[PDB]
Write a protein that binds this ligand. Structure first.
Ligand SMILES: *CC(=O)N1c2ccc(C(=O)OC)cc2NC2=C(C(=O)CCC2)[C@H]1c1ccc(C(F)(F)F)cc1
Ligand SMILES: *CC(=O)N1c2ccc(C(=O)OC)cc2NC2=C(C(=O)CCC2)[C@H]1c1ccc(C(F)(F)F)cc1
Lengths: 290, 290
């Protein structure tokens, strides 16, 4: 029992982390096979971010860059020694709504790990300080590591922005300091529904009134509260949770609809008095049934 | 910027994790130097938890137990090979209010990491499934690992209970299945005050009214809302946060006092509409100022 916001173990990424310096500028990079990835704005100097040559250390072991190139927004420093601590990996691209773990690092040493979601506006609500550029976000499948995120920058609203491991940015964003107003993030509705399932499994059922409602009547309400519309694909993926708790998707929709319109009222669901949207349905299955 | 509930990297603990089987019964254990720790109720059989010989595998490497002994509530399996992946460690005991990271494991393999607090009633609000007994909770200081918790059991109220690494249980609890009604956990007031600081640092200041109030007048209110009394030692440790934000401890006390009595009212502080008590003041300093 218990539900808790839970990151994957960080051991296999920690030993792929490295410190990268170019001129005065030093940040974090990822070491896989014989190539080190890192954000390309490492070649800028920071004085020039106010108005209009490589060192690679793996803790204490110096690698020689023997050349580099630029794929989109990331630099691919080719090194001579090949990392023996390279796990099974693959470079996946994430869609809004999916979640991952972030291992925040400074000067190449890991400091923390935490779980967060790729918001519908393509930003992520991270915890980043200066020096964190180059930290990676990832999922793991027992022993295969799916890298899906590298940090680049902090937008003016406090939120964060970065790329996939091939260099392409997640949203309409660029590796430069500007007022890049990202869209309003909507609340991830499939995830809120999944968290409500995790509540049921674990104790809380007061919100379960479930006046049966249809799909689109819910969507009508959902949208004038800034909830992303629910599609058939979202319904499908709740299948397993539906199966376990014996509460059809339309019911949980309906019960949430009285939450949006009649409110939490200070009442508590799984340690919270607001509707959590940063757990995917697979999250709930991994945590609530192995 | 950003505040996010953040566990220490789990790499150094992951390689001290091992699977332990005794008769039919198999769970998780910790391997340090040449001794493996694990809960002593490994020698029970589970059929007998309803009404009134060692295998140690490190993934695939079998260790020979050459003997064992019982310190309090944990078994110390002495093995012949000594773990080369043993970090700097020390066995600390935690007091209620302090926080740690839990690396949940099944059949000796790590599955997740997460952050939680030792509640004032000596229970912890974990995320544990059958098979998780023997998982450890710990803090790290850059390279020294302070082990402070090993999981034993789940109380009837869903909460969890365990020991320090020397075998002694945290509260008035025992390694047996009974209705052990633990006390009401009070809300950790020093921590709520620290989270309010992290809010200020990061954006949110609406709760800052700060009608100056005294210490004990606050305590009067605090207690009839089930908030643990605030001592001089708690005031002291908020010193640094006080220094950074330029808002004296009595002010934040006072502002929280109007939160307890005039309510959140759906309003949001750092992604939440209830008062979070599971961040220590050192947590805020580590996350908000390196
Ligand atoms: C992500 C990060 O830690 N930093 C960062 C942020 C933005 C950009 C950018 O837009 O470049 C065009 C670059 C960086 N790079 C680095 C840092 C560092 O602190 C270390 C060196 C890499 C920080 C950073 C740097 C400068 C600033 C400033 F001055 F613009 F405000 C902020 C963060
Ligand atoms: C912590 C844990 O995972 N388990 C557990 C819980 C309590 C006790 C206990 O009170 O013993 C006197 C022992 C255990 N031990 C083990 C398990 C396992 O699933 C694997 C073997 C170790 C579980 C567990 C076992 C049995 C039950 C039961 F039947 F009592 F409900 C519950 C959890």
């Amino acid at each position: 029992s218990g539900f808790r916001k839970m990151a994957f173990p960080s051991g296999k990424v920690e030993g792929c982390m490295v410190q990268v310096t170019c001129g005065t500028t030093t940040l974090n990079g990822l070491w896989l096979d014989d190539v080190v990835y890192c954000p390309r704005h490492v070649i800028c100097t920071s004085e020039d971010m106010l108005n209009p040559n490589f060192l690679v250390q793996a803790g204490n072991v110096q690698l020689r860059v023997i050349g580099h190139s630029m794929q989109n927004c990331v630099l691919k420093l080719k090194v001579d020694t090949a990392n023996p601590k390279t796990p099974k990996y693959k470079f996946v691209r994430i869609q809004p709504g999916q979640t991952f773990s972030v291992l925040a690092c400074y000067n190449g040493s890991p400091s923390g790990v935490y779980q967060c979601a790729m918001r519908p506006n393509f930003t992520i609500k991270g915890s980043f300080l200066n020096g964190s550029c180059g930290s990676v976000g990832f999922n793991i499948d027992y022993d295969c590591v799916s890298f899906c995120y590298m940090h680049h920058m902090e937008l003016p609203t406090g939120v964060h922005a970065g790329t996939d491991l091939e260099g392409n940015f997640y949203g309409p964003f660029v590796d430069r300091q500007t007022a890049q107003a990202a869209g309003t993030d909507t609340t991830i509705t499939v995830n809120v529904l999944a968290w409500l399932y995790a509540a049921v499994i674990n104790g809380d059922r007061w919100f379960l009134n479930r006046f049966t409602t249809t799909l689109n009547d819910f969507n009508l309400v959902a949208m004038k509260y800034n909830y992303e519309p629910l599609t058939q694909d979202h319904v499908d993926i709740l299948g397993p949770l539906s199966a376990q708790t014996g509460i059809a998707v339309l019911d949980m929709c309906a019960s949430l609809k009285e939450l949006l319109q009649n409110g939490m009222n200070g009442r508590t669901i799984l340690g919270s008095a607001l509707l959590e949207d940063e757990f995917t349905p697979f999250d709930v299955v991994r945590q609530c049934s192995g």
